């Protein structure tokens, strides 16, 4: 039910991303999609990722998109087009993807049908793992810098490439 | 004669010089002092 609400908000906001005539409006709806995603992450208990999605996707990436799109001052004539003639091609491609890809987990991960019986009493509690609980943050930090440090450093190389490319392609020094 | 070039760099860029000194202390301590403290503990 709550996942129905968040998924409905995400569906509408994403349609607005892909269908809003004004690109500034598209960037703002994109920001709504990331907020809803963060809500889902909070439902999963991943509060670090929930906050980082706000900090990075909304706080940095969407800001970059907004700065660029706002200064472009795009006129609608340059990007307008009628989409009524795409309904069939989207219908087949969407349906095939829908029929295959929304139900891919069904055969492997069969849902438990909720019965008219209190199964909550069959939840077994192991207190041993509860003496010293780890946050999402410290569980991730136990791994990033020691056992998988090479991937961490390669990501640093990727960011360095981004910095160099941004300078070389756009810089015009006064 | 690189002993007043460093003087000139410090005079003209005090912030960068201070940042280099602070970070360099932060790097020097684990690189040099920590293995010394570990060695004195073994014996």
């Amino acid at each position: 039910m709550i996942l129905s609400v968040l998924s409905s908000l995400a569906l509408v906001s994403g349609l607005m991303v892909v269908r809003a005539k004004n690109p500034v409006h598209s960037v703002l709806f994109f920001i709504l999609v990331f907020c809803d995603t963060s809500g889902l992450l909070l439902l999963l208990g991943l509060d670090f990722f929930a906050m980082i999605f706000l900090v990075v996707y909304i706080g940095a990436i969407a800001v970059l998109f907004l700065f660029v799109v706002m200064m472009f001052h795009i006129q609608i004539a340059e990007i307008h087009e009628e989409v009524l003639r795409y309904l069939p091609v989207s219908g087949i491609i969407g349906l095939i993807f829908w029929w295959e890809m929304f139900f891919i987990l069904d055969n492997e991960s069969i849902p438990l049908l909720p019965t008219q019986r209190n199964t909550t009493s069959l939840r077994y509690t192991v207190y041993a793992g509860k003496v010293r609980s780890w946050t999402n943050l410290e569980t991730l930090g136990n791994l990033l810098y020691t056992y998988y440090f090479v991937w961490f450093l390669v990501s640093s190389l990727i960011l360095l490439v981004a910095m160099i490319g941004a300078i070389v392609l756009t810089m015009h020094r006064t | 004669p690189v002993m007043e070039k460093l003087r000139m760099f410090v005079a003209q860029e005090p912030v960068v010089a201070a940042s280099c000194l602070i970070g360099g202390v932060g790097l020097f301590l684990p690189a040099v002092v920590r293995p010394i403290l570990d060695s004195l503990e073994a014996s």
Partner: protein, 324 residues
């Protein structure tokens, strides 16, 4: 949960009153430095001035210029005001006096700070005015620039504490307030807070006389009031954060029974008041930077120093095994 709204109102309403009187206190202190009297007619000692100004604002007709961004224009002040309000959910005023005891509270505060830029950007763009747009772009760039240094200083405190929980950050200062060993970091944090709240000497939106139009120039009535209220609430919040991170929050100055008599909320309030006074004092003392100068300071001075302090603190704590 039925009593949760009562707690939320007991936070929000006194905060709005505190902002209303922070405006008055700024006027009073500024006047007294300038050898004049601030508002002292509307109410005794001018204490009814904020209510009169708020009443005037609500009784002012709204304009809503004939723009094509009718919804966005009114929603921008709502966004900035709500963001200023919601940061207080995790602020502890004393041991156990906090609405949400978030384990990830530090990162949550960083996220709210990062979200603050959108109200200004949207107000500038939606107002259909090139001057407002340019001013909003400059203000947004300044805020994102100083957010980097704020985040790195946060990391320094986090290294010292080992937990993102604000109450834990306070209680980790029982032995010593972090502002003593990290005093330059505290100075850096206060300056970055000034720049992040668009306050003097970094108040570009206040520089109309310098041919720099603010992002809220097209706003009237309660949208303009919402922008103003959010700004002053953020000033109070930055003072509170300075208190929490470096002055030991609700802790007394000395661990003695004489000091432990007075409640921790009073200690916290007094430290916050000191920092608000410093906000006003600084506005009274100095002229303002140009945009280019303050951007240079943000990227060329405060970022390198913040990163250096991160490296030095972490290296020292690792070396002697003093980590939390």
């Amino acid at each position: 949960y039925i009593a949760v709204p009562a707690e939320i109102l007991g936070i929000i309403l006194p905060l709005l009153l505190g902002v209303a009187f922070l405006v008055l206190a700024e006027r009073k202190v500024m006047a007294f430095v300038q050898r004049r009297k601030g508002p002292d007619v509307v109410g005794s000692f001018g204490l009814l001035q904020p209510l009169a100004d708020g009443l005037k604002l609500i009784l002012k007709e709204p304009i809503s210029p004939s723009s094509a961004n009718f919804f966005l224009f009114r929603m921008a002040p709502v966004a900035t005001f709500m963001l200023s309000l919601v940061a207080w959910a995790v602020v502890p005023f004393d041991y156990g006096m906090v609405l949400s005891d978030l384990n990830i509270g530090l990162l949550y505060l960083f996220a709210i700070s990062s979200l603050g830029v959108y109200g200004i950007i949207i107000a500038g763009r939606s107002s259909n005015s090139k001057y407002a747009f340019l001013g909003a772009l400059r203000s947004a760039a300044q805020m994102v620039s100083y957010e980097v240094s704020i985040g790195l200083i946060l990391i320094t405190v986090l290294i010292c504490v080992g937990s993102c929980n604000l109450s834990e950050i306070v209680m980790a200062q029982k032995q010593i307030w972090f502002g003593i060993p990290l005093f330059p970091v505290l100075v850096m944090f206060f300056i970055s807070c000034l720049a992040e709240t668009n306050r003097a000497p970094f108040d570009l939106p206040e520089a109309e006389a310098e041919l720099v139009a603010g992002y809220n120039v097209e706003y009237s009535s309660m949208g303009f009031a919402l922008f103003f209220l959010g700004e002053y609430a953020n000033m109070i919040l930055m003072s509170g954060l300075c208190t929490l991170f470096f002055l030991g929050g609700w802790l007394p100055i000395l661990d003695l029974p004489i000091f432990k008599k007075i409640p921790g909320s009073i200690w916290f309030s007094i430290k916050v008041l000191f920092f608000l006074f410093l906000y006003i004092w600084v506005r009274a003392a100095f002229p303002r930077y140009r945009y280019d100068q303050l951007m240079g300071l943000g990227w060329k001075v405060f970022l390198p120093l913040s990163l250096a302090w991160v490296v030095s603190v972490s290296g020292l704590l690792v070396t002697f095994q003093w980590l939390p």
